[PDB]
Symmetry: C6
Amino acid sequence: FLEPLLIERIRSEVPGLAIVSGVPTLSEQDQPAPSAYVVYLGDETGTGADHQGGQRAIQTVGQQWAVVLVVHYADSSNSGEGARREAGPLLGRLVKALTGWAPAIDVAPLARSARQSPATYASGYLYFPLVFTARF
Amino acid sequence: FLEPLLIERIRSEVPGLAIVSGVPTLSEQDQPAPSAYVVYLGDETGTGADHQGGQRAIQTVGQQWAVVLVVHYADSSNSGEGARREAGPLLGRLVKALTGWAPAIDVAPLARSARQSPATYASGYLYFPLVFTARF
Amino acid sequence: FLEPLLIERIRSEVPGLAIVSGVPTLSEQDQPAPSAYVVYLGDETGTGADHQGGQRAIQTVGQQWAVVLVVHYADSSNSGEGARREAGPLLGRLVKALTGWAPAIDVAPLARSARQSPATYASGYLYFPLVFTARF
Amino acid sequence: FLEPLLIERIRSEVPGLAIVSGVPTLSEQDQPAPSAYVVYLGDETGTGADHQGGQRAIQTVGQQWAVVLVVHYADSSNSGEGARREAGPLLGRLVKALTGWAPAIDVAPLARSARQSPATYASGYLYFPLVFTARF
Amino acid sequence: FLEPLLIERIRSEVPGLAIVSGVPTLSEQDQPAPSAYVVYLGDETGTGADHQGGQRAIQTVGQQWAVVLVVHYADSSNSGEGARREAGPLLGRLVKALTGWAPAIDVAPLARSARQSPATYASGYLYFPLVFTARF
Amino acid sequence: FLEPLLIERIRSEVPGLAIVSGVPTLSEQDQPAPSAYVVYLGDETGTGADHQGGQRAIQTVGQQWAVVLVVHYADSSNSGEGARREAGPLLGRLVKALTGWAPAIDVAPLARSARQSPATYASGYLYFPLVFTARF
């Protein structure tokens, strides 16, 4: 219950052309700019372990959080050259800022996943079903 | 089955500009005032324990209850400065009045959660998936 | 399979102004009169116990049945004074007539719940998620 | 796989005024005649018992089948007098013809339920959630 | 992965009047001809047995497949005489051609069910919820 | 998280007449060309085994991926001659390129299924519910 203090800098208006898009199916044909395009998948819950405490019946609630990549630059049905090759550094930047960059945390792990996040394509332009953990 | 006696003062017409809004997705762009914006999540049920009694097959039914924060003041895609920093006292007020302030209760715990209620943002303005327990 | 014989008197046309309303979301703003406003929640089923018999594979089927309270008299966003305080006797009348007043019953318990039926408000006028058992 | 031979007489055009109604929510206000008004609930399945055989992986499949009663004669919001009191013989006729009257059956029990079939009212005119077994 | 070689003869344009109907609710009132009217129910899956192998994590997947009978000849709300009595040979033909007539099969059982396939009527003209297995 | 490097060549614009079709129900009557027509089925997940590791709570996530075949050439309600007989080599090409052709993979098995992928027809022209594994 303290993430906003760092979320403020986590979010930095990634797209320069998209304005008031309310970003978080994709168009892939008329998007003004390659915005972050965050997505939500689900949640993780469990008890009967170190997560659960005493009063208030709360536990360390597992949280899910994913993103969608929209570049379509150098990849317009030609080949996957420049779609993720350029994203690599961008993917690292996104995964390091939006996740893994947490405030002073005691019971808020803010789990981050640098690797082991497979993504498969479809629709003929670009799909990226990212899989990351939040834990908070 | 006695909460209304204190609910009467729990609710005190938080918004001064919103009238007959039937508050309990959000707009985040044309809301007249920062109302309480309460939300409902689910329920908790269980038997075979101290909750269950004899006749009437009733038990201490776990109840879920959450809220949504809508301020968008000092936080208009600029930064999370003034969104929750000002809410902190307001969040405490809300969580202490709407929850944890119960009448003479014998089997109505009215559980309250001051901490351990994480919230994540999205849509580019403000999201707050509050997680609180009611137990009644 | 004999409840109608007493249901006939259970139902007595509670509202004097509402006519052919087909009562069993609520409006809370243009309702002519405070009708009973019965609601249905679900069912309870189980076997491998005294409920199950021999032939016909039938058992004492648990039945769920609830009501909604619509008074909005002395409680019009002012305070919860007169909403349930006046309902108390009315709630007892409803729960004693509609439930617990059964015909000659051998395997039809017709369970009734005088207490332990919590209700929470929302929408800014009145909500009452009653929880009662029927067992038949 | 032989029921039609007796279904032919099971069905005998109960309503005299309803024509091509395709009977199997109810109106309760403009129905020409009190038709049978059969309804379907679900199915029952199980293996690892005498139901399952050898080849073809088939078993004695439990089947669910219910009916809806629509009389609204002598019961028009007045009282439950003549709604089920007259139905009693009619209910027996329906449950004995539509169910329990099976052809030469070896693995087709065609279970019938004379009693233990509770029904609850609602909507202000008449409801009858009949519960019967078919087993085939 | 070889069924088409025999499916080619399995399907033989059963209806002579229905053209480009895309057959696999029914009308029962304006159908030009009594087509096969195949239907799909679900699937059967399982592991940890002889079905599962080594690589490719595949197993002998249970497959469900059913049909709907539409004759309405000699059975037009009169009686079930000629609806299934004439279908009997037709039902055998359908169940022997569409199922049980498989190519050279090693791990494709193509299960067939001659008997033990109950069907119940409704809607006042004809219903036939056939239950057959495919296993492939 | 490296598949695109080979996906780039996996996808090679199979249809020559279909342009900007956004391929991944089918029409089967006005399709310009026999495109790949990939489909998605679901996912496979599991823990408590060699899949799960230490930090990041990730595991070798099972992935599902299937295709739909649309040829309708030499098979136009005549017979299944030329529908899959010609597809055989095409099916092998598709299953070898789109699957089983993976980059340098350490924890990305990219499972491929040459056989044991049954497909059943329906709708009167062509259906092919392919079943393949991706594991990544």
